[PDB]
Ligand binder design. Structure first.
Ligand SMILES: OC[C@H]1O[C@@H](O)[C@H](O)[C@@H](O)[C@@H]1O
Ligand SMILES: OC[C@H]1O[C@@H](O)[C@H](O)[C@@H](O)[C@@H]1O
Ligand SMILES: OC[C@H]1O[C@@H](O)[C@H](O)[C@@H](O)[C@@H]1O
Ligand SMILES: [Mg+2]
Ligand SMILES: [Mg+2]
Lengths: 720, 721
């Protein structure tokens, strides 16, 4: 419908209707719900909610199905005074029913299109089940793998996360101006604003602190790219940002989000994050929490009642302008409009779209794009279809391969490693073991299965509940039984491939040392076993690269490729000296660096002549010719980094600024060109200006952060 | 001499002498030294230095003795156009020749007098050997025990570090206006400005980053307290502060240090820190390093030559005002003047008499017994009867490496090891010494034999000092693994076990506490370690130290500290076991041992007098504490008072230490102490960098650690005093 009819709706709304429009609730607090009606009475009492509240609530979160939504919406509209329909939101994080690889794994794809297709298939399926908005992408920069939520990020690089973030928004929303028409597309909600992934010591919900310059330089960019790409909503974060809970942080949400980033959509609190400003000790009670959160431009409170119980009194007492509320309601109604709910409150409600063969194939291709081959000694992999396999370990038969933040996908639809492998390989013998134990009986069985076979596939992993939200690990290791199992299997004299399943970087040196190959599958989602089989057999050729550094040990954290030089860099020419930046007990380098990944193919790259000089404001075009010098078809991820050698601020040794995954047949050669605009050469200075300084830059072209050729360019002269 | 002549001296110096005055060199680069003269020619040449340079250099660091100094100063004065003497600086960090406990152990003393005595003794001995300045106190807040340099700090509390830092300055300098009169006193140099201990991942020299509010709230106070207490010098830090190396950080050094902190003394670069801004990538060459460093107000370049090879060109070309140079030189000459070096360039110099005396040694012992921390003592194993038969086993049994890191002048041959220490007090001791990093089958047979005979094991475990200090970073804060196996083995021998731990950082000690009956943390006590150990074990001294740094559950809990924020989902005893709260799946949130924790052989009872329920803004809270030793044994308790601001415009720490006093109490004896928490103690830096006091609720915690406390509420409001 048209904007004046919206604007009118705000004017026609009572104060209480407006307040309640600023409330989001779980599906089973509404009448009409097809599930959990036995939780409804106790919780409605606990939250002190009325029919008046629930009949005028803005939004539902976490409906279980199309029937739940239809049911809640049909009933809500029966008794809603103005017929303002409900907006329905869900966690569609890396798939709805067809589960794709976890987002950290998607990061390792280095493949924008894989990311977009994931998001599109997710939207197609979720819209089919009645949801209007997904709480995705998660755009928190992560340098600390203790934190469970690293599984949700695409890793430690702001540029990669910004690029994959846009791919996700594009995937979920298509053309955002047509969301009222493209009812297979849905609204994306960027989270968590801001800097949540810098949680101190990897401890969930823990303190975050960085200078404002680092916030802008490294922590803000991906949120901003997703916003500029059209993301419809933003969610606040649980953490303090410079002492102040993001949720009630006026500078962050008014000056930065709405001011500088020009975001004019709905800001939704994370779960109870409004009431929780009370725990953080920046509000004395719900009245202050509501006041401060509303001043900050938080439009929709998720599952708490500070607003519904306090906004009226604050407005009536003059402590809070009713203009702020009206602005909030307006943003709510606009989102409903943009979604086309005023014409179809059921947004086209499609079962035939859910869990298709086509989608499953796509999730599988996503899996094979995302896995990272870390070791492959003496060409153990790929295996011949007739290698006799002993498949052992806790991930041999576990159905837990879909990953964390899988709210809707079902393990019964998933394909386990045993099933995947039996499809491909004639002889497979399987000994399954527990996640956290290694019994004598186990060892006897393993020995018996390995004696018979020619290769061990040693499938190790985390349970997914050891990560995700409030899944913090102080020590980033598998249970010790898994390392002992790898130590044991290794003594059996047969070649060993470790298929690792997990949601975070782990200490994997003892795994790499005890095996001939190491394949990092993360959690591939619904087609895990097949993803695994194809890669093992060579039907697919591994092509993923690490989007997050694998530390030598827990105590190296944080370690990350784009680091400062320090005043005493360890060089190769001073290594061994005492007074340089180093540790007594481990290398400075991570066990595996950012951008690292092996292939069954072999490539060579060639960078065309670059200019020696460039003007300020001018783009650097980088041309790369790549050839597959092997007999095997494969993909390579070309990466381009830049360093600013000297600057008014100490600048990272390398920053990723472009990348492209290139598919190549045997013998085949392609050419790609990259534009590094002058923005790539820019940075925030001590005064928070985005600036470009004349001076020397190094450009690195290669296939990891360490496998690169270096070139120099002098920037100066005039500005374009 | 008169300010007026100092002034004149500046007008009378050439440009080249003015520049050289801002250079600091090792002794063996000067004519007249009596050690290492064979390094002089190669190094003078590598640094491109000339007679003109060295003959006019401002300063020496690291002279080896009184004779070194006298030789060098004699030669320099003979050839120096205007007779401007050298100022001689050294690292006198926790003692000169009488080695005292490492500063982290001194922090555990929670004892201001102990710290001042340490410094006074240090100053006595060092002035005796010709040194004018000490590069001490080290006032870097630490939360990361991976970092080697935690040994040099007094811990994770800004208030403790501020208090003790003042005590150090007082001890070294006494009356800072009389340093030209009191020649057994010396100039202190606060370091490292600023925030160097926050190095990322405990990696040496590594990136530091925090919001400016946190800089002010937690990282700056101790530097400021020492400066306000009259520290004569300040040294820059190696790290970036908000992206910019501290040494060329104009805001940090001109605006904060000289502006807000009113510091008008000599600002000395850390070692090579001026040239190293080039490595940090904020200066293209020595010319830029020198310019940016002089703009930032660095007066004295330690052992690099940017200023020396570049200041002239910068000044000549108009890139840099000569007035800055004049200002730097004036501060250099003022310091020399304050040290009385224009009247007496040899600063009172035969004083061997004063070095390593018996009285000083007792002082260091007392410091050691003040600083050790008793962590476990199950069923009163300690103190031991003098007739107890002791199996003394481990790498610290006989190691002479007990003086600690940052001991540049102390000699292990004067130190007392644990064996010698114990043989003085206990009649029966059998000793099985083992290596730091190994445990052989042969060792185990030998340990088994010694333990079967004796009544108790004194299992002495520890770090080499080289595993800490500068560029001694450990990713994993653990002893070598052989030592944990030795503890584990020894526990199976059926006899009671005390572990005497010697180290320079918090370590993972849960396996040590679990494998023994008592655990005594000695850190590195210094020259008298053996005796410090014996007196505490035997009960001639009663342990009384408290932890000034949290001991983590495991390496990956780092950073963990008592003065932490609540978060939005604090783990409470009511929500325990719930999934969605701030917690780890694999460890507790609490450190294994918390700040302010320490056991005693005595036992104490505290009661806080009634506190007002309400307070005006600007008003002090007087806190009166009656403490009673209720046991038969004489001892000290450390009373501790913390404050929390329950609600504020910034999320505030759940607790902050605001006062403390160590109280000596004879058996049965009772005392009353009172503390004033001024309104500054209720104040904090707000998002706009204002120090503010906000009306509202506080909690006051009175007790004997950060966790053993009674809690009281006070409402602040109304009007302002
Ligand atoms: O599921 C609702 C929301 O729950 C919160 O606890 C998480 O922080 C969000 O990422 C999530 O979207
Ligand atoms: O030195 C760089 C600095 O610039 C100053 O102008 C600001 O106050 C600081 O907060 C920032 O860290
Ligand atoms: O000895 C001169 C100086 O050496 C530097 O490496 C240290 O950082 C200082 O703390 C010390 O004072
Ligand atoms: Mg530059
Ligand atoms: Mg308050």
């Amino acid at each position: 419908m048209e904007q004046e009819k919206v604007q009118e709706l705000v004017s026609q709304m009572t104060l209480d209707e407006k307040i309640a429009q600023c409330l989001q609730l779980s599906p089973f607090l509404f009448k009409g719900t097809n599930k959990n009606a036995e939780l409804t009475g106790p919780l409605l009492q606990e939250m002190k909610l009325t029919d008046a509240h629930t009949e005028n609530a803005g939004s539902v979160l976490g409906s279980s199905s199309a029937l739940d939504m239809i049911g809640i919406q049909e009933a809500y509209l029966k008794t809603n005074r103005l017929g303002i329909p409900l907006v329905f939101m869900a966690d569609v994080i890396h798939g709805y029913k067809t589960v794709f690889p976890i987002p950290l794994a998607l990061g390792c794809s280095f493949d924008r299109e894989t990311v977009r297709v994931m998001a599109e298939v997710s939207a197609l399926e979720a819209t089919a089940d009645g949801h209007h908005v997904t709480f995705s992408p998660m755009l928190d920069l992560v340098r600390d793998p203790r934190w469970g939520r690293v599984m949700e990020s695409t890793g430690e690089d702001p540029f990669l996360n910004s690029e994959l973030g846009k791919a996700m928004v594009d995937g979920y929303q298509g053309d955002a101006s047509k969301l009222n028409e493209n009812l297979e597309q849905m609204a994306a909600c960027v989270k968590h604003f801001a800097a949540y992934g810098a949680a101190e010591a990897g401890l969930e919900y823990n303190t975050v602190n960085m200078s404002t310059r680092e916030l802008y330089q490294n922590y803000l960019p991906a949120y901003n790219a997703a916003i500029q790409a059209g993301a419809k909503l933003v969610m606040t974060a649980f953490n303090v940002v410079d002492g102040i809970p993001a949720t009630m942080n006026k500078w962050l949400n008014r000056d930065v989000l709405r001011g500088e980033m020009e975001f004019d959509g709905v800001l939704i609190s994370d779960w109870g994050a409004v009431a929780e400003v009370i725990n953080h000790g920046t509000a004395r009670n719900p009245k202050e929490a509501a006041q401060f959160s509303m001043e900050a431009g938080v439009d929709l409170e998720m599952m708490t009642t500070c607003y519904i119980h306090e906004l009226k009194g604050l407005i009536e007492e003059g402590k809070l302008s009713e203009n702020l509320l009206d602005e909030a309601v307006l943003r709510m109604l606009n989102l409903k409009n943009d979604l086309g709910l005023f014409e179809d409150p059921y947004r086209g409600l499609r079962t035939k779209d859910i869990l298709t063969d086509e989608s499953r194939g796509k999730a599988r291709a996503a899996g094979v794009e995302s896995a990272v081959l870390l070791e492959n000694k003496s060409r153990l992999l790929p295996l011949a279809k007739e290698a006799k396999i002993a498949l052992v370990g806790p991930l041999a038969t576990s159905p837990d391969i879909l990953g964390g933040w899988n709210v809707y996908g079902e393990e019964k639809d998933g394909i386990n490693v045993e099933t995947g492998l039996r499809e491909v390989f004639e002889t497979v013998e399987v000994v399954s073991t527990e996640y956290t134990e290694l019994s004598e009986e186990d060892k006897v069985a393993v020995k018996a299965a390995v004696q018979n076979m020619d290769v061990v596939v040693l499938a190790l992993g985390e349970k997914n509940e050891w990560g995700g939200e409030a899944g913090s690990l102080a020590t980033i290791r598998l249970p010790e039984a898994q390392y002992q199992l790898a130590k044991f299997v290794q003594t059996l004299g047969k070649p060993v491939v470790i298929t690792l399943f997990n949601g975070r970087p782990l200490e994997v040196k003892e795994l790499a040392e005890s095996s001939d190959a190491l394949l990092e599958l993360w959690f591939p989602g619904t087609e895990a076993g097949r993803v695994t089989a194809d890669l093992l057999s060579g039907a697919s050729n591994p092509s993923g690269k690490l989007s997050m550094s694998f530390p030598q040990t827990t105590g190296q954290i944080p370690v990350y490729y784009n680091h400062l030089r320090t005043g005493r860099p360890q060089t190769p020419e001073n290594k061994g000296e005492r007074y340089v930046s180093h540790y007594l007990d481990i290398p400075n380098e991570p066990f595996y660096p950012f951008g690292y990944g092996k292939s069954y193919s072999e490539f060579e790259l060639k960078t065309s002549s670059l200019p020696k000089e460039l003007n300020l404001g001018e783009s650097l075009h980088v041309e790369v010719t790549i050839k597959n010098i092997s007999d095997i078809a494969g993909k390579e991820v070309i990466q381009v980094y830049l360093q600013d050698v000297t600057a008014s601020i100490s600048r990272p040794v390398k920053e990723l600024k472009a990348f492209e995954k290139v598919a190549l047949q045997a013998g085949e050669e392609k050419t790609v060109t990259f534009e590094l605009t002058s923005e790539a050469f820019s940075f925030y200075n001590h005064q928070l200006e985005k600036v470009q300084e004349p001076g020397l830059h190094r450009v690195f072209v290669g296939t990891s952060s360490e496998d690169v050729d270096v070139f120099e360019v002098e920037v100066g002269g005039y500005v374009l």
